[PDB]
Design a protein around this ligand. Structure first.
Ligand code: 03D
Ligand code: 03D
Ligand code: NAG
Ligand code: NAG
Lengths: 333, 334
């Protein structure tokens, strides 16, 4: 086709990026995170029990208000790293940017306040592949492509830094106003996960980590750049970061002193400077600053793997190419 | 005709959108707000006393340096919701977006420091109907239509989000598809003479708690905010738990991200704003106040009482002002 659809995102604290979708006729509007690490669509239910606060605190779909809903009941449990959610299939019209599409989505009838009570958004739009879809339900993007319509079989993510639009997704292309120069692509290790091969992680001038290769999931639904507990321990130790109770911290004044961290992908070096990975809330010698890199031991089959989340995307605008099973990166602007 | 002209705009702090016009021979350049809520053109005059500080800080039209000027001199006063300007009429050639028109405009000689010292712009280009023109002067758009150059008898507005980007864009005689998506949905004007439509109701969250029974919505490009009657606002705000200040309402910064959506029921479609769209989020602190870009303004009859949908709304929905067919169309902005 010859269209593109974009969704303006809200950037909450550099940790949550979400946009609007409407579900049903007329549409009921929800805030969703668009997640490449998963493939299901889900929102909180009409029918959610109001005990778990999450539902009491989220917008709930009311199928009784949809002129276009179509009953489905097949039950679902959606398991992510942070948590799990349960509900059941439903069939309705979803508006995304300027596109309307019929979609099987999950009606979230069980939704735990950990982490759900921390979510500034209502639900999730999985931008992952069918192979990861609970219920082997056709993922929204796939459904949108069926539609002809989009110019290219691709979708792009822009995440801004918290200070402006908070971010933007473009379905069917990329927006040149938000990147510099040209994309360089890295091919997926295999169809089914948005995961590529990584040939090294350098601290400053030196390959400290992943010397003999590793995996990197490009995850729009993850806040930080993460690696296993061991990798991160090693990385932090190279940075001189210490763990302050819950997290790794640095003296805020010495943040501008930390080395660059480079990620070797597709034969290039994707470099983040300390300003790109240190939360410089402050610059005092009297305060401790947090880092936007965390350990995350991801289970196989997917893991162990590094996850390149918002911290990475902020630096590199990203294009997910379905057609060619590759990811394109360009300097965000 | 087959022409379409666009005016690039500057976005100052999400509250003032303006562009440039040239008046006179040679051209004397001014920043102006293009206002659908009024129909006169005006800029500050070189005849404005310097005892008016706003005239000391603004670009001044000097008829004596213009060889195309035509004297008129009739007096006029222009009353806006937030201030008033006074002066006299002149005639000159004005260029706007590459279009040149001979236009009667006001040379302002009295320009209050409050609010004008706070304007980044110099003057105003009213985009309304002659029905609203002070001094019966013909509005710019009518003069431009008279030329037979525009592809269509419509003008469209794009207002961007601020930036750290194009601040905005006005298209004369069309729309720019680069700036909207999906389709336009239209509401016929209650009447010609005013860019005001019927509004079916107002929801805070889901609860149509406002405008049950109908109300009016003035689609105002010269308005920074979305506004309703003081009583409307007191109720709206009640629901948001925002505190009333002198000129605005506030919420505790931390509360901001969690405010409910606000819907506007117009012609058929619901126009939904999220808190991110109407709160000025400038921190997430517990001990800091965050303004809302929804205000109370009681506009007098005959136009009011009405809600005014200004920049808060337009940022999210691209707007087309259809003269030919007396209607306004909205589309999702991009
Ligand atoms: C292969 C898997 C690692 C993919 C992973 O499940 C999906 O990307 C999943 C999608 C999120 C979307 C927001 C709601 C919770 C699920 N991300 C993840 O769980 C991320 C960590 C995975 C190691 C990478 C956690 C996310 O950063 C999570 O904190 C976002 C959140 C914020 C506030 C409340 C709840 C959740
Ligand atoms: C029928 C009326 C409601 C129409 C209304 O007077 C016009 O739209 C008028 C046009 C402006 C143009 C800039 C110079 C001041 C007048 N907008 C208004 O006054 C608006 C409130 C009306 C309830 C809608 C607020 C305006 O946006 C005002 O904040 C802009 C301003 C900023 C800084 C300094 C001076 C002015
Ligand atoms: C619900 O959808 C699932 C998966 O598409 C399907 O296999 C099941 O038959 C559906 N139920 C109904 C009401 O047909
Ligand atoms: C001023 O302009 C009005 C409108 O054209 C005109 O009718 C009036 O005669 C003019 N007055 C003078 C003194 O030029």
């Amino acid at each position: 086709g010859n269209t593109t659809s974009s969704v303006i995102l809200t950037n909450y604290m550099d940790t949550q990026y979400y946009g609007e979708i409407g579900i049903g006729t007329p549409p009921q509007t929800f805030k969703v995170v668009f997640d490449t690490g998963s493939s299901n669509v889900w929102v909180p239910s009409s029918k959610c029990s109001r005990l778990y606060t999450a539902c009491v605190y989220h917008k709930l779909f009311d199928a009784s208000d949809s002129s276009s809903y179509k009953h489905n009941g097949t039950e679902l449990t959606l398991r992510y790293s942070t948590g799990t959610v349960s509900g059941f299939l439903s069939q309705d019209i979803i508006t995304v940017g300027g596109i309307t599409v019929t979609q099987m989505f999950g009606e979230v009838t069980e939704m735990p306040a950990l982490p759900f009570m921390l979510a500034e958004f209502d639900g999730v739009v999985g931008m992952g592949f069918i192979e990861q879809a609970i219920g082997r339900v056709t993922p929204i993007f796939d459904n949108i492509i069926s539609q002809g319509v989009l110019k290219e079989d691709v979708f792009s993510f822009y995440y801004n830094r918290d200070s402006s639009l908070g971010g933007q997704i473009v379905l069917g292309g990329s927006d040149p106003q938000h990147y510099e120069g040209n994309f360089h692509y890295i091919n997926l290790i295999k169809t089914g996960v948005w995961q590529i091969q990584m040939k090294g992680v350098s601290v400053g001038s030196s390959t400290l980590l992943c010397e003999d290769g590793c995996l990197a999931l490009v995850d729009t639904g993850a806040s930080y750049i993460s690696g296993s507990t061991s990798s991160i321990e090693k990385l932090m130790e190279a940075l001189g970061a210490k763990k302050r109770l819950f997290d790794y911290v640095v003296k805020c004044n010495e943040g501008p002193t930390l080395p660059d961290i480079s990620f070797h992908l597709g034969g290039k070096e994707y470099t983040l400077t300390s300003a790109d990975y240190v939360f410089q809330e402050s610059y005092s010698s009297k305060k401790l600053c947090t880092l936007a890199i965390h350990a995350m031991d991801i289970p196989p089959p997917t893991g162990p793997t590094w996850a390149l989340g918002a911290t990475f995307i902020r630096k590199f605008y990203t294009e997910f190419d379905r057609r060619n099973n590759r990811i394109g990166f360009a300097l965000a602007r």
